[PDB]
Design a protein around this ligand. Sequence first.
Ligand SMILES: *[C@@H]1O[C@H](CO)[C@@H](O)[C@H](O)[C@H]1NC(C)=O
Ligand SMILES: C[N+](C)(C)CCOP(=O)(O)O
Ligand SMILES: C[N+](C)(C)CCOP(=O)(O)O
Lengths: 39, 210, 223
Amino acid sequence: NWFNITNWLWYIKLFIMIVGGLVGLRIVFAVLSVVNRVR
Amino acid sequence: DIQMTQSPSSLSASVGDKVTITCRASQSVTKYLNWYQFKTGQAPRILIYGTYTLLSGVSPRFSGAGSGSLYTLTITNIQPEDFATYYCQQAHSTPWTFGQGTHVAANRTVAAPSVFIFPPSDEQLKSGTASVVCLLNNFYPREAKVQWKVDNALQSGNSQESVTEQDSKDSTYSLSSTLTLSKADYEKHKVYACEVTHQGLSSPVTKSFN
Amino acid sequence: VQLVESGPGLVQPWGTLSLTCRVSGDSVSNDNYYWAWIRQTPGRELQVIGTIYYSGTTYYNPSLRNRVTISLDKSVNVVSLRLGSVSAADTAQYYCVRMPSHGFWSTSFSYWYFDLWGRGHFVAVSWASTKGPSVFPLAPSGTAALGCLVKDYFPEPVTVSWNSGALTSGVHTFPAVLQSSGLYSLSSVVTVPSSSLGTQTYICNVDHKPSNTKVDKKVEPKS
Ligand SMILES: *[C@@H]1O[C@H](CO)[C@@H](O)[C@H](O)[C@H]1NC(C)=O
Ligand SMILES: C[N+](C)(C)CCOP(=O)(O)O
Ligand SMILES: C[N+](C)(C)CCOP(=O)(O)O
C-alpha cells in the first residue's frame, strides 16, 4: 500500500514546510546537532 | 471499499440552466474527489481533481466544491456540448471507486415524431424470414408507444425496439420497432399497420401497407 | 498524446483476454506517469483493474489480483493487460489510462486522478463463434426516409456509414438489439429530400471486423 501512504505524507509535507520558512533550516541543523550531542 | 453514490441518477436541464450534481460517500474522502465527463463518441475526459482544481481546456463554467462525505459538481451556464454523463471518483483509499454516474440530458419543447413504415426486403423473404420496420423520427420527450396490428389483430412479444441517443444539435430522439416473423406467418396476413402514441400527438397516428 | 487500445473482440469463457495499448506521445519509461486499466461493464459500473509504474511497481484491484497481470514494453512503447479465467462477467469496455505522478515538491502532491483516457476497446465473452451480418435495404415509399437493416451478427460491433462518409446530416444509426436467437441486429436510417430519390444513389457501407465482413448495399426507391 502506497497511494494510501500519500494521504499521510501530504500532512508531513505541510509540517515540514511550516517549520521550513519559520525556523530557517540552519537553526534546524543546529538543534539537530544539539540533540545528537546529548548522546 | 468506500461507497460512492451520486444524486440525482438522471436529470434534465434547459440550455443556460445551472446544474448541480451531488456525490456522497459512506466515509470521509478528505477532498480526494475527481470529476470526469463521458460522451458516447469520444474518449473519457477528466474535468476536476482534488475537489476544486480545474484542468486546462475545461471550461470555467464547471466548478467543484465539498468536504467530508459530501461533494458537488456545478455547471454554471450549461451549453449543448455539456450534455453528457458525469462521474465522481475517490482517491483516498487503496481501491479507487467511482460513483454510479449522473446523466444530464436536455429538456426542450415537445416535438411529435415523424412516422414511417418499411416493408421487408425481397432478398430476406427469399432467405425465409421477414422483418418489418416502424421508424419514429426526431421526437421529444423520449416516451412513446408503438403498437403493431396485423389484419386488425393486436401483436405482442415477436417485436423488439431500439432507441438512439439524443441528437447533438436537434436534442431529440428516434426509435425503431422491428417486427420479425417467419415467412409463413408474414404470408398469412394482408394488412400490416403501425400505430403510434406520443405526448405531442392528438390522435394516434397509424401507417400501413398491404 | 495518443493512446490506442486493441485486442480481441470476442474471448471464450475460461480463456485469457489480452489487450495492448500503444502510446504515441512519449516513452512509457517516462518517470512522471503511472498507467492504468479501467473498465466499464455494460451496467455502467467503472472499475480500476490495476496500475503500473515505469519502474515495475503494480497495484491490482483485490478482487482480481489472483488472476490479472499488467506490464509495459518500453521497446515498442506499449502497455499490456492479461486477464485469466475470464467469464461473461468480464464483458466490458476496457480503457487504457494515464495517471500523473506528482513528486513531493509539486503544489499538487498526493492528488491521484486519471487525467487522460483512450477511446476504449470492447470485449465480449461468449462461447458463440463469429458470424457476419446480413444487410437488407429499407426502401422509401415532404422528406423521405430510407435505411439499412443489419441483421444476425455476432459479436459487437458493426459500423455503418453513408456514401463513404459524405452523407452525415440526418443520419440515425441505432443501438444493436439482442434477439432471442442470441445474435445482434440494428438499423441505420437517413432522411433526405424526396425530390432526390430518382437522381441520387444512396449506398450504406457496413463493416463487421470481428468476422472480417465488409458489405456495400445500395438503397433505391421501392417498386
Ligand atoms: C421540462 O420543463 C417543464 C417546465 O415546467 C417541467 O415542468 C418539466 O418537468 C421538465 N421535464 C422533465 C422530464 O423534467
Ligand atoms: C487532503 N487535503 C490536504 C487535500 C485537504 C485536507 O486539508 P484541508 O484543506 O482541510 O486543510
Ligand atoms: C489544489 N492545489 C493543488 C491547487 C493546491 C493544493 O494545496 P492544498 O489544498 O493541499 O493546501
